[PDB]
Design a protein around this ligand. Structure first.
Ligand SMILES: NC(=O)c1ccc[n+]([C@@H]2O[C@H](COP(=O)([O-])OP(=O)(O)OC[C@H]3O[C@@H](n4cnc5c(N)ncnc54)[C@H](O)[C@@H]3O)[C@@H](O)[C@H]2O)c1
Ligand SMILES: NC(=O)c1ccc[n+]([C@@H]2O[C@H](COP(=O)([O-])OP(=O)(O)OC[C@H]3O[C@@H](n4cnc5c(N)ncnc54)[C@H](O)[C@@H]3O)[C@@H](O)[C@H]2O)c1
Ligand SMILES: NC(=O)c1ccc[n+]([C@@H]2O[C@H](COP(=O)([O-])OP(=O)(O)OC[C@H]3O[C@@H](n4cnc5c(N)ncnc54)[C@H](O)[C@@H]3O)[C@@H](O)[C@H]2O)c1
Ligand SMILES: NC(=O)c1ccc[n+]([C@@H]2O[C@H](COP(=O)([O-])OP(=O)(O)OC[C@H]3O[C@@H](n4cnc5c(N)ncnc54)[C@H](O)[C@@H]3O)[C@@H](O)[C@H]2O)c1
Ligand SMILES: Oc1cc(Cl)ccc1Oc1ccc(Cl)cc1Cl
Ligand SMILES: Oc1cc(Cl)ccc1Oc1ccc(Cl)cc1Cl
Ligand SMILES: Oc1cc(Cl)ccc1Oc1ccc(Cl)cc1Cl
Ligand SMILES: Oc1cc(Cl)ccc1Oc1ccc(Cl)cc1Cl
Lengths: 256, 256, 256, 256
């Protein structure tokens, strides 16, 4: 496997529909040694779910908290000497930020929170994980959406938070490059996950991608997972600060 | 004047050198009726600066506060029947967010504050000004910088907040379009302003720009101001969600 | 007028529906001294049409021919000492390049011809006009379409030619910057012109822009013309290598 | 191997240092069955180079000729029941198009030739290969360069042709998508190849890249080859119309 022996932390695994689940399946297939995080109460749920990946550790991490993130790496460091990659597959904005007219709905705190969790958390993981990642062709990958690049209905302040995220990925790539850490993002097309039901427009978005996309289909978590996997491999060491669209080609067309 | 009669609110006027000053000069030349905001204790400084423009109002507004933004437009509603444009020329991030390695310097709070004042404040002005701007070919312009698009040394968290601001400009353009309101940004090249002091490598950027850009020069506040004035005129009613680079062409080249 | 006394050459004027016609109206309004080109047989047609703009010259120029382009500037130079701007508002691809599946329809020669006329002609005009434009804040503007940036049905090899054009604009901006010549493009939304009937998809494209665009409308030749006018003014001397979308905001959104 | 069984045609193999050589090494390692084309008198040189790959066929194809491209696929149809991928790793422009000021150097013919071989030839391969690639998760990859996106010294007409090639990649992706064929490009950083000799400022670009890019290094043909191999694999079936930068992050930064 092209990830054989690599030590990789996966965030955001919630159900077997999660993009993180596809990433896990892909990386496990390729020989990676995998660890996982969960938020507070989903402990036993995620614990059962990720067992099938022979995890080196399953640890709590609500990225809201500087403490939990710091402790995540303290505990992870009791299990692993160093770390090969961090996979960031997590976002959040209050529900009222994801419906209706953007200007009607947006609020100062919702904006703040969407950004705190969906964008800042990526650089926070980088900050704490850096020491374990130093000097080993380490990698980071974040999940984003085309809502960052173009305005669209519903996605609203999450769209704005994704743009912050993509920029954070670029600045993170610049900052950590000297340590041989590559930092990239996968821009995934619409996939029916738990988080997706939180988007007003989702059924429409999903249907629309299939019709308009060049490949005339929706993507799945294995296409996404496989791409994230590659981006944590030695084959991808020339790639950094990049956004790769895994969206059946939706990003390259206009009209349809 | 191609702004004759138009009622425009200008934020960010701090000194003789502010970009907002160039904007003000340009719009006053073009027949605009102007209002200005100030923060903190700069009431006298700003009144003195903007006196030559015969402003209708010089009002307090620290965009950290929702109430002040709300009261700004209530007071404005007392001198003006309606608003033609809002010029957003305001940004802030704590000094420790603008020096050294991005991952070293980044903090949750500094991230939050940068986004809150540099980006959220644009949508906040849009939210409270919206009713006065409805249905008169109204306009909004924000000031951004190429650090939103590309990572660069030192700009760090502001770079990320600027990416957030540009996405906010797009979603705002989408949200306000049905009201005939166009929403755009001007991406200015480095100009020597008071804020530029907070950029550790600023003299670097300025000299680099002049040497590398096609027009082999630095831009000035009138170049930026004229462009902002244009983007508030009836000539630009076909343009929204756009970012216009006023940077002597720096944006279009690679190497020099 | 903000173009008062400026000497500007306009190409592509064919009917009073032409984008070039809007550009002419706008620049004449702003005090510009205007000259025009035509292709071979449209001589008397264009001659009648542009009379209303008090043209300094109306000259033949089929950009297919290196000879006619060279002679255009020889004759123009008998009338004007120097030249302030060139407006390129011309494109062509064989009809069979603009219908159906791109791969089915595209041909080596059609590709060549689309590029020769729609892209190369811009740099050819720059090459010959340069000497008259030297050292006077001169300008060039080309018309493009979003078909360059994104693949779309029908537009096909014209889309590919527009991408070449936009790149030619950037390389031209780099090359001529040292002479103080600024070089930009306006990316216009769909407008019902003569050339438009040559596009299979046009009615659909037109209708689709109105529904999806933030400003919920189609643009007109005066919005486009006014923007081109501004881009040939002293107000725009900080702008070069830029593409400005005048498309009611279509470019910034996804879905609708 | 993640290309096991896949039948892939590789163009552009000229030497030990060609990018096509890195691509070939990577795909042979991953289980691909390979074929190669050559131009002119390099039949013996290429057969000798690609012998270790146990190619199914080493065939003549100068992409200036439609007939040769047509006959290529007829001959290929004699060894293979179907084609899984085409690697386009080929460009050309006359030397006088790659030195000095772009406007000084550009000619109609040099423009035409650059586009014809560097860009049109990609769609031409797509046209004639299409029937063998139908409905097998087939793939196309072209090699491009950041000179398509930004203007830079010397690259000149090739820069423009590369912009044309990237648009062709998008329209081809749109056209071939219904056939399950994904179409992408790899944007490689400067690598020391035979062609690089024709770039007057190449040692400039190479040293600049290593100093300025986040990973503080130059890319190599295996980094590019691995990525191209990935883009021909079943793992990448969610990706089309994409451009992936394999440039040590150069694309994402500004200043250094
Ligand atoms: N589903 C899609 O169509 C799609 C498309 C593009 C991008 N993405 C992105 O992919 C990622 C995965 O989302 P998903 O769609 O698989 O949904 P999901 O519901 O499976 O995953 C959402 C994850 O975010 C985690 N999360 C939320 N707040 C957190 C916090 N404070 N700390 C730690 N974890 C937190 C949740 O536990 C959950 O595991 C997200 O970044 C999402 O924005 C999803
Ligand atoms: N100077 C440059 O090179 C340059 C380049 C690109 C973009 N910009 C942007 O242009 C804008 C104007 O900046 P400038 O360079 O003219 O500097 P400046 O220092 O003259 O103006 C900055 C303004 O931001 C205002 N501000 C800061 N915090 C505020 C708050 N909380 N509430 C209300 N106002 C607040 C300040 O009062 C000040 O007037 C900024 O958005 C800046 O990021 C500047
Ligand atoms: N109509 C639209 O929706 C639209 C949208 C975006 C961009 N554009 C671009 O704007 C420009 C103006 O086109 P238009 O739509 O106003 O159509 P139009 O039919 O009025 O103009 C087409 C012009 O190109 C000229 N032309 C063609 N071949 C020529 C040659 N070999 N030499 C000299 N002139 C030649 C024709 O004479 C004509 O004047 C074109 O570049 C077009 O691609 C048009
Ligand atoms: N070397 C770099 O730094 C770099 C960077 C970015 C992109 N690229 C691109 O990668 C590709 C491979 O180039 P390379 O750098 O490995 O150089 P190379 O000289 O090894 O390969 C160039 C190939 O183009 C082929 N070619 C030229 N004209 C042809 C024609 N008419 N018909 C068929 N084949 C023809 C040549 O035979 C040769 O094998 C090119 O598209 C190039 O533009 C190279
Ligand atoms: O970013 C997404 C994009 C799409 Cl199309 C579907 C789901 C996405 O992911 C989320 C959306 C909203 C919230 Cl609150 C949390 C997450 Cl993880
Ligand atoms: O965005 C800017 C970009 C440049 Cl090149 C120069 C000044 C800028 O403006 C700021 C920079 C830092 C802070 Cl704290 C506040 C402001 Cl207004
Ligand atoms: O580029 C265009 C885009 C649109 Cl939506 C409409 C018209 C356009 O202009 C042309 C289209 C085809 C040919 Cl043959 C010539 C020209 Cl001038
Ligand atoms: O595109 C390239 C970019 C770089 Cl940095 C180096 C080599 C490249 O490839 C070429 C450059 C010029 C010619 Cl004539 C032919 C080819 Cl294949």
């Amino acid at each position: 496997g092209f990830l054989a022996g690599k030590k990789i932390l996966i965030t955001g695994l919630l159900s077997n529909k999660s993009i993180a689940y596809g990433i896990a399946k892909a990386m496990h297939r390729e020989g990676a040694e995998l660890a996982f995080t969960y938020v507070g109460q989903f402990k036993d749920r995620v614990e059962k779910l990720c067992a099938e990946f022979n995890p080196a550790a399953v640890l709590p991490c609500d990225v809201i908290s500087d403490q939990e993130i710091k402790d995540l790496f303290v505990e992870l460091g009791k299990v692993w000497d160093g770390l090969d990659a961090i996979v960031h597959s997590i976002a959040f904005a209050p529900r009222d930020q994801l419906e209706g007219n953007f200007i009607d709905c947006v609020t100062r705190e919702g904006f703040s929170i969407a950004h705190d969790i969906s964008a800042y958390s990526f650089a926070a993981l980088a900050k704490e994980g850096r020491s374990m990642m130093k000097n080993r062709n380490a990698s980071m990958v974040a999940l984003t959406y085309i809502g960052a690049e173009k305005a669209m209905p519903s996605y609203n302040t999450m769209g704005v938070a994704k743009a912050s995220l993509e920029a954070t990925v670029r600045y993170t790539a610049l900052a950590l490059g000297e340590d041989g850490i590559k930092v990239n993002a996968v821009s995934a097309g619409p996939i029916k996950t738990l988080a997706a039901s939180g988007i007003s427009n989702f059924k429409k978005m999903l249907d629309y991608n299939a019709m308009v996309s060049p490949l005339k289909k929706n993507v799945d978590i294995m296409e996404v997972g496989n791409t994230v996997a590659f981006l944590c491999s030695d084959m991808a060491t020339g790639i950094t600060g990049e956004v790769v669209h895994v969206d059946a080609g939706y990003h390259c067309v206009s009209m349809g």
